[PDB]
Amino acid sequence: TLRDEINAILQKRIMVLDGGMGTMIQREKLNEEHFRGQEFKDHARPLKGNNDILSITQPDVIYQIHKEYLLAGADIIETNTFSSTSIAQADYGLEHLAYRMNMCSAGVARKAAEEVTLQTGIKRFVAGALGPTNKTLSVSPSVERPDYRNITFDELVEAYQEQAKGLLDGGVDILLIETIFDTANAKAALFALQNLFEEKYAPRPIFISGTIVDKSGRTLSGQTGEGFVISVSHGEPLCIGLNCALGAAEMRPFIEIIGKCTTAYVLCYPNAGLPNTFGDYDETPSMMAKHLKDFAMDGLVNIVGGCCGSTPDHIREIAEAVKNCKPRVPPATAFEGHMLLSGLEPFRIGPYTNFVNIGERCNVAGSRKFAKLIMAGNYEEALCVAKVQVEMGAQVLDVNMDDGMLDGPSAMTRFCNLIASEPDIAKVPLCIDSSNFAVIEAGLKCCQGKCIVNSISLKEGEDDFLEKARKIKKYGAAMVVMAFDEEGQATETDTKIRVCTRAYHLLVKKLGFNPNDIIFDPNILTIGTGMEEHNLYAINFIHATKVIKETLPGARISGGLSNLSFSFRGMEAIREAMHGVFLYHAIKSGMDMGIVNAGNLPVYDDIHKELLQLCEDLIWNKDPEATEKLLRYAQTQG
Ligand SMILES: CN1c2c(O)nc(N)nc2NC[C@@H]1CNc1ccc(C(=O)N[C@@H](CCC(=O)O)C(=O)O)cc1
Known part of the structure; x- marks a missing residue:
């Protein structure tokens, strides 16, 4: 040719x-x-x-x-x-x-x-x-x-x-x-x-x-x-x-x-x-x-x-x-193994890169202040949430507009147009999050650089997953794959591993997706709810992260860290301690990033040893009384 x-x-x-x-x-x-x-x-x-x-x-x-x-x-x-x-x-x-x-x-x-x-x-x-x-x-x-x-x-x-x-x-x-x-x-x-x-x-x-x-x-x-x-x-x-x-x-x-x-x-x-x-x-x-x-x-x-x-x-x-000069030899292995993202400035996630924070507070469902400002039409003040998140160490911003009282694509377009007007907020990549693909497309059509696409899964079959992934590859953005398939959400470790492997081998082989742009999500789920089935979730997530990172080349791992501590809403210190304890094990497991509260994560040495131990029992299921022991400890702070 x-x-x-x-x-x-x-x-x-x-x-x-x-x-x-x-x-x-x-x-x-x-x-x-x-x-x-x-x-x-x-x-x-x-x-x-x-x-x-x-x-x-x-x-x-x-x-x-x-x-x-x-x-x-x-x-x-x-x-x-x-x-x-x-x-x-x-x-x-x-x-x-x-x-x-x-x-x-x-x-x-x-x-x-x-x-x-x-x-x-x-x-x-x-x-x-x-x-x-x-x-x-x-x-x-x-x-x-x-x-x-x-x-x-x-x-x-x-x-x-x-x-x-x-x-x-x-x-x-x-x-x-x-x-x-x-x-x-x-x-x-x-x-x-x-x-x-x-x-x-x-x-x-x-x-x-x-x-x-x-x-x-x-x-x-x-x-x-x-x-x-x-x-x-x-x-x-x-x-x-x-x-x-x-x-x-x-x-x-x-x-x-x-x-x-x-x-x-x-x-x-x-x-x-x-x-x-x-x-x-x-x-x-x-x-x-x-x-x-x-x-x-x-x-x-x-x-x-x-x-x-x-x-x-x-x-x-x-x-x-320039008749006699030799041609430039390109760097054929330029940033090989890295994941390349961009806003107004490049963002790279390589093998030696630390844990990458993704701001969670630009979420209508998950954030109180952001939702209150968005329903009021005050996007001008709603940009301040992203501004403060970036100021507090968030390296990627997660944008979610899923709500029955809002026109999804229109709000997403307006917010992605407003983000680009501010340099420091726009220099970090965006994570486009929505359960509807028509909102993901609207978000991608407004972004300047290369972004991350959230919430794509095998839920509606192999054909629909391949169609969505092909569209995303044409759009040229990154892609977060959930642990969700035709049988439902993956709760057990082996189910998570099977779903993630099935998703990976479709993307790499059937579609020819770039292996470094795949971000698997083993679905962090809530623990401490008082239900027997809600005790192992952290263990399965960690083991699935280990198995995925040890067998899927190039594929990253992420997760909704804040989902783990839903049972302790209002007790923000315990939520922070649980997030820190879980991260200490997940990063060692191979968790590359996650949708985390960037400014509210503590170092594993700062957490009080009693509270750290209680979080260890609750997360690792070392004690069936841990879920009540944590609340008993919390009640002493009154
Ligand atoms: C569902 N979960 C999730 C996930 O599990 N996996 C992916 N890839 N993406 C996502 N995105 C959405 C979600 C993670 N984002 C979250 C999760 C939890 C919260 C949360 O608990 N917010 C607090 C309020 C905190 C505040 O006001 O700032 C609350 O009481 O609801 C806020 C945002």
Whole structure:
């Protein structure tokens, strides 16, 4: 296929990609009438600056620019489709022409590429450019309305699907998602491409490139380079990297950081310097070539090019500068064995990582204050619960909106839109928790980075479990599997182990799920209720954790720690002691994380030895009188 050829080429030499088409068009200096051409002379809206209309109104200009860039030593050419989406063309009243526009852009690029290939023999590739669109999905249009978004995930998916249909019909060699101001739009584009690649179309190599705004190392949406790489890696892009907004000097540390994270190839095409007082990117090709040669000699990049200001002369010098340099060797084992999550910043859970706290208080069912604020519609104050949880050591936030008095998906969407408006709350990943999959999907469609999906199980059969897991894998998030199957909840140790193994071997084999993104939950259940059957639950959970961690490679273990101490509600000291004692054994067992009250967990040495011993008898069933002995001890505190 085409991906095999591109991979073979990238393993031997550095590939040169396009340049400043948007500036070469300004060098033509077309007026209003050239934009209209023959067909759009009757159009009632001005097409000034619509660089994508030239694929039909002035095809010769675009073809000649492609030819000049191609003879300037370039190897990959972007199609003239930066704003050819139905949303970007809305400012010009050409919503209905996106498919035709993309077909004609692909054709006019393909003719030039084929002619140059016939001239030189060196095969040239055409990359379909998917624009970021002026609409942002993670950034509110207005500061006063943080939860408001003027575009949704489904609309963006539909528009990008419409664009990529025309691109694929035209026969583009590569699909390129570039100048990403918001990685959520990149995820939507990947979603549309994944729909297309299974509905009719054969797969294509996928190129992704972000845009770092300034020296902060963060995109316009606030996410850093590692977070971006983690967020968009679920689509398995052949190449990732940066472009624009920074020269070849300021971009080097971020390219280093990104190349240290991804196992895919690194593509870098920056600006041609900085804007002068006259508005021109005046860095001569001599400095650009030497800077890209410095990038290549160190082994930072595998594809080089140029952003705005890169005339074909810049590409002509660069293709000679990087002619002899060896390609970058990717870190084929980059963070092997780790679990990669992301918010505005990367989050990693490796073999040596300590116990990971997941905040429980962002739960309508489980939290009193959060539920009281949510039913009142005061999400503005409800964000403070997540803020305080993060301030108290919670590394992931668990969001649950399941209630019969609330519209699930709408509340979940509003809260996930409000979360992204605050940086420190948004830098930690989210755990999307709901018994309804329509709420999990709504939560995933709003998240910027890579999140965790909670409460999926084998309850409704193997087929439904596989369908849900396939949808989640397409969404690219983490997944918590409950110990629940067709026969009911798993209470015994062997039942938990059987259910978890059956879930694991379906995901890994039938679906090809990533083994490091599976988080089994052996269903921590309440003890101390005074019922005989409610005594062994901690023991079965611990033994099942041991057995699962010792036999399922990569799979993590979590649990609802607060569920264990339901019988002692109101006696918060005993609840904290029980949580600490249970954690001391679960972490030793292999419990990687859990939905825990992050700020209310004590160290195993602090707990009073009498209370610690009583919790030990109750948890480990060392004494049938422990459940009453604990209450008897509690009554002494009055
Ligand atoms: C059901 N359980 C659970 C689970 O067992 N497994 C998974 N994967 N996920 C989850 N998520 C929900 C739940 C764990 N979350 C909880 C569990 C218990 C509580 C709780 O007891 N809250 C106290 C109030 C505490 C407060 O007001 O802050 C109460 O009296 O209800 C609060 C949150």
